Design a protein around this ligand. Structure first.
Ligand SMILES: NC(=O)c1ccc[n+]([C@@H]2O[C@H](COP(=O)([O-])OP(=O)(O)OC[C@H]3O[C@@H](n4cnc5c(N)ncnc54)[C@H](O)[C@@H]3O)[C@@H](O)[C@H]2O)c1
Ligand SMILES: NC(=O)c1ccc[n+]([C@@H]2O[C@H](COP(=O)([O-])OP(=O)(O)OC[C@H]3O[C@@H](n4cnc5c(N)ncnc54)[C@H](O)[C@@H]3O)[C@@H](O)[C@H]2O)c1
Ligand SMILES: NC(=O)c1ccc[n+]([C@@H]2O[C@H](COP(=O)([O-])OP(=O)(O)OC[C@H]3O[C@@H](n4cnc5c(N)ncnc54)[C@H](O)[C@@H]3O)[C@@H](O)[C@H]2O)c1
Ligand SMILES: NC(=O)c1ccc[n+]([C@@H]2O[C@H](COP(=O)([O-])OP(=O)(O)OC[C@H]3O[C@@H](n4cnc5c(N)ncnc54)[C@H](O)[C@@H]3O)[C@@H](O)[C@H]2O)c1
Ligand SMILES: C[As](C)(=O)[O-]
Ligand SMILES: C[As](C)(=O)[O-]
Ligand SMILES: C[As](C)(=O)[O-]
Ligand SMILES: C[As](C)(=O)[O-]
Ligand SMILES: C[As](C)(=O)[O-]
Ligand SMILES: [Zn+2]
Ligand SMILES: [Zn+2]
Ligand SMILES: [Zn+2]
Ligand SMILES: [Zn+2]
Ligand SMILES: [Zn+2]
Ligand SMILES: [Zn+2]
Ligand SMILES: [Zn+2]
Ligand SMILES: [Zn+2]
Ligand SMILES: [Zn+2]
Ligand SMILES: [Zn+2]
Ligand SMILES: [Zn+2]
Ligand SMILES: [Zn+2]
Ligand SMILES: [Zn+2]
Ligand SMILES: [Zn+2]
Ligand SMILES: [Zn+2]
Ligand SMILES: [Zn+2]
Ligand SMILES: [Zn+2]
Ligand SMILES: [Zn+2]
Ligand SMILES: [Zn+2]
Lengths: 373, 373, 373, 373
């Protein structure tokens, strides 16, 4: 009965920077050509969502953040072919137009439609959200902290009907990012020695990926020792903290492996720890993968000799996945009991408790928090 | 015979930094255990040698430089098994002891015996040169600006007897580095687009590597437009200079290619161009290889965001070659007519005209000058 | 912690003879009085371990083989006084209780505690391993193809901490055996002419021993001519194959040396070659050392006149070394670069690739393959 | 004079095997170049001579046996420089030409001129004896069961004129063999425990040798207990017989010494007891010397594991003595009263009674029986 009509629903709106959410009553426009309106079933709280709140990430306001989620297709726009009302799907912050260079290349995944600049809009350059007359912006081609959202078709992944929305939502960000980091970006090898900087939802996902890649050793690092128990239990053959010693973490790690660190992953978001992760992989054959999003407008300064000796330094976006291709496959892999997401979800709460949720994340008391509708 | 005795010969000595070469009469101690004394037949003037003079490369003094050469074995020390007197060889600055992690690693090449710290001695920590009752240091496990030198066996490659020493000496640094940079370090896929920053002896070699890789486009970049004719002769599809436009080189290249720069190579040695090279490759699926040697003790400041999107940034030592295995294979490939080295040799002069060789190097009027004995 | 507790870990188990390994999850009991639980860091693949598989060496089943290794002391049992947790150690397949006759005799080394009969248990007659509720047998007082093992204190050699595990593990069997076979058992004298039958890990170590002793001539013998290059490199003066001539190898050797073969060494494990080795040393003043292990339950038949004329024929266990006395000394000698172990190691692979190590051995492609944990 | 003329005398000839002696009239040709004709004063009856009669030793017929003797030089052939007519000498069945590997090598003694193949001729391939027209063959470079014999100068030891020929004749075989077996071949050590298999003439000499080495225990073994009284008188500390118990002799011996049998000597001539002798010495640090002579054309089958554990097994020819150097010295030591030979001679008879001497040998009634002229 709503298809074609504006949908009045609620949404955690953010009117300005460094402000708390405001659960407003908003109006969601119907989907235009090649767009899709989705009803969010569950959505997790990712650390990147907090970046906007903190103001460590450029964004227009007002805006509805949230990007990690599972939903149902309420209605499809004109010309859509990959989905139909009733289909279970997962909104993709990383699209796959399949037409641009990065999409045409098997070794690329950052679609030209990727909202990196903080555009806060869809393909045609407009918004679909209105609240109190004034228009509300989108977040990374998704916007999930709402009962309903509209994303372009190029940002819709049709998944298996039987998939549990409250768990598979991690495939929309957190999990796929860390797992694919190892498996598809760093391409960790069997017998390797990996080092993961940061033991959050993504960090812990990298571990699973490395352990699954065959790494005979996986060392976890975190200032928060409370994250160790989770680490060891996930695949960390050990875990330490930078504060445990005064000698550079790079030296410590070398000594621990006898200078044979094949991979280092930065999954925090600190420039200082990016240098640390680089310096910690082997000087000639080590690879350092940066997964953590660095704070906007900050220049990095390091010793270029660290790179000259042969080191490989690369970035990662959504764990190197080709969204529309890989997401539905990973879902089937979860159904086939291959991976246990449950280890990652430390809290399931009703959407209304969103404020409490963000509190948890920021206190170091939680991995993932899944909000329910 | 000369075997077992100290050899008196002439060598181009550098008594201190920022001073011309002094062609002194020196004493070359005989080869100890697993060492090899070599008679130099032909040696190339490489830019890195100039770094010692200019003072931008750490080195002890006095010292004898030169590291690109072809020689003949005069006498082997005790225990030597890979070479015998009269054998044609190429001394190696990048050793291959076959037993350290890097040598054992199929993805490594920086042997632990590499003199990266400017020690200026052999494996046992001593020198073999003397001049006026003063010990003269070695340079990067080689020292070829001399009638005779002594290296460790791990630093000797036995090559085909019929190899013209005045041509294949480039296989000791110049040509191997460039060619390998493209084929081994960068793994240039066929049909891709490559951009090379710097059209000197190594830069031109990189063009040959990309050309051997099947690249559909290879764009040369140099401030000296006189280098352009050569670049085109060895395989460049077109050449340009940064001064030709006011907009950033990264944007000029993106526009020229439709946002498709597969691989960039920094073949100059300026941190400035290292960032330009990084920034000039596709933001998500591009690879930038640092071939140029950055000036001593200089930190590099760049925008981390260039990396995070997915760019791969990696160093390169000797073209990623495992010295003792690859050098012989390259000489065989030269004799098998797989490539031309004549194009890179602009001048062939007697060893005594070494200062002119350096003049032509610095005045930009020479790719490779080869000094003969 | 793990002290006093059962350890769950992985181990390559053999359930019956003529079967491939089965990496299984096993439990390792804590150490009882005067025993020591050790974590394995690196372990070699010695041909003896292959005899168990092939069934040419008696063993009870199931069993965990492997015996050439380096480790770190996880925990010590009651009354232990020679090692402490943290200590680096080499487990000893040849004990040294220091109380028995062979231990008190300066010319003996086969301690009563040696497991030569396939006992597969510790000094108190019991096992320390369980897998699927059923007890698993030890191998030659060691058992190292497991993450953890328990040995009697009489079978632990505390070594230098700075010792690289993946190198000094050969001092646990292979190197010490062939080396001591020349220096300690055969007592090769300066100027002699030695002959080695078999050029694998042990054979190559014999040649190093002969050279170290002062042999003027070392002849290598092997069907696999691909082994010649390394035999020559390590010390040989020439190598040949039994197939090169139709006349008995003894005659050939007589002819090459003009009937002056002082020492022959059988480092293979064939009754046939044991005889060949005997008949090849001088008929009156020759010495023939048997290093290779004869297939179990096979009687030897030879011409006694070979012996009567004066030939000395003697067996050899662990190169004649007194375990806890000579092992620690060899590690220290190694650290002083007295001998090269890396020449013997042709492959380093992660433990999980155990079959490939064995396949490489059996296909004639490796000397020593070292497995890392 | 007789010098230069054929000498007619008597000799004990064997026309064929398994037939008693025949005292015939024979012709002894004059000594050719580098040969010596000797008058036999006294000669012992060695068990080896009986081997020829029994047919368990290869020989041509007819032949004149006997090899243990003392004599006087009748005439010297052309070129002879070491002895003159009238000199007292001992014919050597083991030559010392001083120009062959064994001879020149300090550890060898089996000269190249030794008659091991059972030729029965002198260096030049001819005989010197004639009887009833037909030529009679020599035995082991000696032939002493005759009044006159001719030997090569390499088989002649000039000894002290004051030496009792009826006692020192044992130094031509029996005594020197047994004595040297312990002192020179086995190299028995002070305080060791030796076991001698066979209490005959050579066995008793081994005991004497072991007693001079400082042995602490010397256990004698024989099936004939009447030999025990003499064994104890020459040095044995106890004696036993294989039939004294049912358990294997090796266990009996082990039990008696607490598994500490340093040396075993076989001085009987059986393959079975040679095996018993090996198995009887300490499995790791024991040495078993084979002195007895094994019946020709018989293969020995034993368990190689007996040898593998470390036992040293060696043969013995004439107690390992360099005949021309050692025989004189031994006589000199006898005259210096180092040992008593009288204990070994149980019967002194005239040469015509040779048959009785042999009867007493094969009945067990005598140790050595000396025949006089
Ligand atoms: N690249 C992308 O595709 C992508 C995807 C998802 C998330 N992210 C980014 O990855 C990073 C983490 O994601 P998350 O959900 O796992 O965050 P998270 O907050 O749950 O985990 C952060 C971890 O870093 C640890 N940490 C902080 N400072 C530390 C330090 N100095 N040294 C060691 N550990 C320290 C914290 O204790 C915590 O364990 C953030 O920058 C996020 O924006 C990026
Ligand atoms: N990685 C190694 O293994 C290795 C091996 C060989 C040489 N090198 C280094 O590689 C670099 C080049 O070697 P080369 O012998 O070919 O030097 P070269 O002097 O012949 O070439 C340098 C080129 O760079 C050009 N150039 C300089 N500044 C420029 C700028 N700002 N922009 C564009 N072009 C500019 C010059 O005109 C010249 O053509 C040096 O740093 C040398 O030390 C490294
Ligand atoms: N005595 C002990 O203390 C002790 C110690 C270690 C090893 N071993 C024994 O030593 C022997 C060899 O061990 P390894 O570790 O050196 O093994 P290995 O397999 O690496 O070497 C065997 C070598 O002998 C060669 N060979 C095989 N058949 C041949 C033949 N018919 N004639 C000539 N050469 C032939 C093989 O090609 C190979 O080169 C084995 O029996 C092993 O059990 C004994
Ligand atoms: N190697 C040489 O240089 C050399 C020198 C002299 C003698 N021999 C040989 O040495 C051996 C001994 O010579 P001998 O002159 O002293 O002989 P012998 O006949 O006097 O003594 C043999 C002894 O062995 C004992 N015996 C035989 N079978 C027995 C058995 N099964 N178990 C235990 N005892 C048994 C006999 O009772 C006798 O006491 C002979 O074979 C002889 O040919 C060798
Ligand atoms: C069960 As069964 C034949 O291995 O004893
Ligand atoms: C010795 As079984 C466990 O194979 O019967
Ligand atoms: C034949 As079985 C040792 O497995 O019982
Ligand atoms: C008798 As014993 C324990 O030394 O072999
Ligand atoms: C004659 As005695 C050495 O046995 O006492
Ligand atoms: Zn996210
Ligand atoms: Zn796209
Ligand atoms: Zn932090
Ligand atoms: Zn190396
Ligand atoms: Zn100096
Ligand atoms: Zn160079
Ligand atoms: Zn420049
Ligand atoms: Zn010119
Ligand atoms: Zn079974
Ligand atoms: Zn072994
Ligand atoms: Zn059992
Ligand atoms: Zn012992
Ligand atoms: Zn074989
Ligand atoms: Zn080495
Ligand atoms: Zn001789
Ligand atoms: Zn004849
Ligand atoms: Zn005799
Ligand atoms: Zn008998
Ligand atoms: Zn009688």
């Amino acid at each position: 009965g709503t298809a074609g009509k504006v949908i009045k629903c609620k949404a955690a709106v953010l009117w300005e920077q460094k402000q708390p959410f405001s659960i407003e009553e908003i109006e969601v426009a119907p989907p235009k050509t090649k767009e899709v309106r989705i009803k969010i079933l569950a959505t997790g709280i990712c650390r990147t969502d907090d970046h906007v709140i903190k103001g460590t990430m450029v964004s227009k306001f007002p805006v509805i953040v949230g990007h990690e989620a599972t939903g149902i297709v309420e209605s499809i726009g004109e010309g859509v072919t990959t989905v139909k009302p009733g289909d279970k799907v997962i909104p993709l912050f990383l699209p796959q137009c399949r037409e641009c260079n990065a999409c045409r290349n098997p070794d690329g995944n950052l679609c030209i439609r990727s909202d990196i600049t903080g555009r806060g809009v869809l393909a045609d350059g407009t918004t679909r959200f209105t609240c109190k007359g004034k228009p509300v912006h989108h977040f990374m081609n998704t916007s999930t902290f709402t009962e309903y959202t509209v994303v372009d078709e190029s940002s819709v992944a049709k998944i298996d009907d039987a998939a549990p929305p409250e768990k598979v939502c991690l495939i929309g960000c957190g999990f796929s990012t860390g797992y694919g980091a190892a498996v598809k970006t760093g391409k960790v090898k069997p017998g390797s020695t990996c080092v993961v900087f940061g033991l959050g939802g993504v960090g812990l996902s990298v571990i699973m990926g490395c352990k699954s890649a065959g790494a005979s050793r996986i060392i976890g690092i975190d200032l928060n020792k409370d994250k160790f128990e989770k680490a060891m239990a996930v695949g960390a053959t050990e875990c330490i903290s930078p504060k445990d010693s005064t000698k550079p973490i790079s030296e410590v790690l070398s000594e621990m492996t006898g200078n044979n660190v094949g991979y280092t992953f930065e999954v925090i978001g600190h420039l200082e720890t990016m240098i640390d992760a680089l310096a910690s992989c082997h000087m000639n054959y080590g690879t350092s993968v940066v997964v953590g999003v660095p704070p906007s407008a900050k220049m990095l300064t390091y010793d270029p000799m660290l790179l000259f000796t042969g080191r490989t330094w690369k970035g990662c976006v959504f764990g190197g996945l080709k969204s529309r291709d890989d997401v539905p496959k990973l879902v089937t892999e979860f159904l086939a009991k291959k991976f246990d997401l449950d280890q990652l979800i430390t809290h399931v709460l009703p959407f209304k408790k969103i404020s409490e949720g963000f509190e948890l994340l920021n206190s170091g008391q939680s991995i993932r928090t899944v909000l329910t509708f």
